[PDB]
Amino acid sequence: CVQIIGGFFTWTPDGIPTLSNITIRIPRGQLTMIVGQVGCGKSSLLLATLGEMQKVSGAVFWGPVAYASQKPWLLNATVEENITFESPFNKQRYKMVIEACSLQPDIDILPHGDQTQIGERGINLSGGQRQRISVARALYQQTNVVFLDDPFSALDVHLSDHLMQAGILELLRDDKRTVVLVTHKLQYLPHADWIIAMKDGTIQREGTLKDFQRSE
Ligand SMILES: Nc1ncnc2c1ncn2[C@@H]1O[C@H](COP(=O)(O)OP(=O)(O)OP(O)(O)=S)[C@@H](O)[C@H]1O
């Protein structure tokens, strides 16, 4: 599991801390949902568990980890190269991810069927396509922990439903992966195991759905 006791850090060598008093356990085989307002330290905490920000005074333990950032980035390469991401190409695995990410029709819509040269930063692509490709790259890798920082921001309602059902609750949950998602919706809270309520860079409530509905 991913354990954190006493989160304390900031985006400066010295200054007022935006991470303060964070203690979270993320057990294996769990869909951990993080929710909060705009500016509650959701992404900051997501990077804190990744080892990206060395905390000042605190302990954090959990290793290679897949991650899909809020802003999608690509490579000046093909789409298959983006999704495989230096991984041995598979027939059933790659096609399963392609179908489970609602990308095959949009990929066939490109001027080249596949192996299309994605432009610099993705000029010949839109935001939804880039975010879908990023989630596909995060899903295709054979790892344990998978962080997804708001992958439903540039997607439709049907696209989000299909992605969470086929990929999250039936493909990530299939292999029993530690999936930590940061989004703000309601169709995902009953599907999760641990809800994390963030406010002003601090965890206000922590526990399960029944442990949250039975508290203030
Ligand atoms: N890379 C960075 N460098 C400097 N400051 C940052 C960086 N990322 C975040 N911050 C600061 O951290 C504060 C909170 O950022 P976030 O945790 O990302 O907000 P959030 O609402 O919890 O999550 P979002 O908005 O869905 S990414 C912001 O006011 C930023 O100024």
For the CA atoms of the chain, what is the radius of gyration?
Answer: 18
C-beta neighbour count of 35 within 10 angstroms: 19
Q: Are 139 and 177 in contact (CB under 8 A)?
A: no
CA distance 150 to 138: 13
Q: List C-alpha distances in Å: 50 to 46, 66, 145, 211.
A: 7, 10, 10, 26
Which pair of structure tokens corresponds to residue 45? Answer: 């905490």
Measured from the Cα of 45, ligand 1's closest atom is 17
For the sheet with 2-5, list strands across it. 24-26, 2-5, 59-61
The H or E element that residue 3 is part of is strand 2-5
Q: Are 151 and 183 in contact (CB under 8 A)?
A: yes
Q: Are 176 and 28 in contact (CB under 8 A)?
A: yes
146 CA distance to ligand 1 centroid (A)? 20
74 CA distance to ligand 1 centroid (A)? 22
* Reported resolution, Å: 3.3
CA distance 143 to 163: 19
Q: List C-alpha distances in Å: 33 to 3, 19, 55, 107.
A: 16, 19, 22, 30
How was this model experimentally determined? cryo-EM
C-beta neighbour count of 215 within 10 angstroms: 11
Ligand 1, atom 29, residue with closest C-alpha: 39
